[PDB]
Structures are given as C-alpha cells and as structure tokens.
Amino acid sequence: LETX
Amino acid sequence: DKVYQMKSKPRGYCLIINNHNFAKAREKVPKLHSIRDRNGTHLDAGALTTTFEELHFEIKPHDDCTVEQIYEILKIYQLMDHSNMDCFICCILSHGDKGIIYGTDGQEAPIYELTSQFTGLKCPSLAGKPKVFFIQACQGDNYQKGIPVETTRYIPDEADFLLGMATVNNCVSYRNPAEGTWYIQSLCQSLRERCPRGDDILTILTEVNYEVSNKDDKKNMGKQMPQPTFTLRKKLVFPS
C-alpha cells in the first residue's frame, strides 16, 4: 500500500 | 423535488489530470526528495474513463502535469463554451497536502484556486449547471486513526459545485499500485452500480464514505475518510  | 437537467449528449467534459511521474519534484524541491511515482494511477484514470463514458461524458485525459500546466488546462476549459453541456467534471489524481495538490514538478496548487476557475462569472456557459470535482490526493501526512463500532433570476457565483475529497484534511489517502486508489475505485464502482438505479450523487458519495471507511491499512493501522463538500441546489443524477 502507498499514499498520495 | 428539483433535479438538475441532464439530457445532453455528451453531458459535458470530464477532465482527468493524471499525475504519475514526480521526478521533477524529487529534483527541484528539497522537501519532496523521496516523493514516489504514483504507480497504479492509470487504473484510476481508466476506471474514471469507463465509468463516465458510460454516463455519456466526453473524457479529456491529461498525463503528468505540472502546476502551471494544470492552470493552463483549466483556463482552456474555463474559456470554452459549455452551452450545449449540462454538466462539467474535473478529476485530479496526484500527490497533495493540506488544501493543495502537487504538480509533477512539486509546486503547489491550492484546491480553491482550481475550483474557482469555473464559477458562474468566470464560466457563464456553466452557470446554473453542476460542476463536479474529484480530488484523489493526500491532504496531509497523518494516518487517520480507527475507532471500534458494533457491526431574470440571480443565484450565487459559487453555486452548483460538488467537491469530492478522497480524505479529510491533515490525513493521507491510499493507493494500491495493483488496484488503484481506495477512493476512486470505490467511487467508480458505486457510480456504475447506482446511477442506472437513478440514485443521486450525494447518496452515492455517502455509500463511498461507507465503503472506504471499512477499508484498513494493516501496516500502520490506518483508515481513510473521504469528505464531500457541495453548494448544489438540486439533486444531481447521471442517467444512462
């Protein structure tokens, strides 16, 4: 999972 | 009750600002030295495309845009004639922080400076017509915590806006590089499921709130809370  | 007119084909333009490559940001802005490329963002652009084409919009995608490039794009559609359109949509997919979104160059574009380009005065051919913005980005670097629960006539210049934020202020929003973002994927699924039913956008965005609220980031025990804002004066539906 990655964040913006 | 009152429902916005939505019978033109196409309904209007659907702008997609799709920022993936943030090499310029990493190079120029010290603060963002390790900001990452937004892998999987094309899954959002594609889902938005499929969804709003089904809802009879004309999709206008723009990939890897700096802040100035975004402004140029919005100014173009601001100056365009939407007289034969019933609606306008703008989707932005990028990194962001509190109240702003980042261009690929790492410069900041305040969200209000984006939406305000399409006020009734600045874009008269959209006066009286719904203008919808979807923002997929962080609004800060904090993880949203979880909580346990049991299972003629004159109108305002800034009327008829709908702003769909992927997250509340101060907090992150999530992107699965193999699926897309929590917000956009959920939004498009709800749209395609409920718009043929005749449900309005507030109801659908409520369902989106519900759906994203049930998703977990198990690595950091994080949640995400989308946040719509609106000045809509009528029910907004997208017939198909």
Domains of chain B: 1-240 (3.40.50.1460)
* Chain B interface residues (partner A, CB cutoff 8 A): 36, 38-40, 94-96, 136-138, 166, 172-177, 181, 217, 219
In this structure, which amino acid lies at residue B7?
A: K
Give the catalytic positions of B in this structure. 95, 138
Query: Helix (H, G, I), strand (E, B), or coil: what is residue B61?
Result: strand
DSSP code string of B62-127: EES--HHHHHHHHHHHHHS--TT-S-EEEEEES-EETTEEE-TTS-EEEHHHHHGGGSTTT-GGGT
**Is-contact B3 B237, C-beta < 8 A?**
yes
Rounded Cα distance between B5 and B87, Å, is 9
Closest alpha carbon to B167 in B214, B97, B85: B97
Compare CB distances from B94 to A1, A3, A4 and report the shortest one's residue: A4
Rounded Cα distance between B222 and B96, Å, is 18
Rounded Cα distance between B101 and B131, Å, is 19
Edge-first strand listing for the sheet containing B174-176: A2-3, B174-176, B180-181
Give the resolution in Å. 2.1
Closest alpha carbon to B106 in B17, B16, B27: B27
**Is-contact B29 B106, C-beta < 8 A?**
yes
Cα angle value B159/B164/B167 (rounded, 5°):
140
Work out the minimum CA distance from B176 to partner chain A, whole angstroms: 5
